[PDB]
């Protein structure tokens, strides 16, 4: 959700997203998320799966 004035100001000045990080940091973060999910799934499978 965004209001009309903010969107108009964004579009008038021709803004675009910009970043200073590299590709590998993002994929490392995604791998961390997947690892957390895998850890929880393994714990549930070895303790709670009944």
């Amino acid at each position: 959700a965004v209001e009309l004035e903010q969107l108009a100001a964004y579009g008038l000045t021709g803004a675009y997203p910009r970043t200073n990080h590299s590709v590998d940091t993002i994929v490392k973060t995604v791998n961390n998320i997947s690892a957390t999910y895998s850890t929880i799934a393994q714990m549930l499978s070895t303790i709670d799966l009944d």
Binding site: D24, N31, S34, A35, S38
Partner: protein, 51 residues
């Protein structure tokens, strides 16, 4: 066109002969190689497993 027109080619041939016959009389001795070593590794980032 006389014998003067052949001076530069004469010098070329003379330089070639001087180099060739100075190579013949030069004394040649084997040298010891002292640089053998296994120091040419490659780096990079490890492909660590996730799980």
């Amino acid at each position: 066109m006389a014998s003067t027109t052949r001076l530069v080619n004469d010098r070329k041939q003379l330089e070639q002969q001087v180099k060739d016959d100075a190579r013949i009389l030069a004394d040649a001795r084997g040298l010891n190689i002292t640089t053998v070593a296994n120091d040419s590794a490659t780096g990079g980032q490890a492909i660590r497993n996730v799980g």
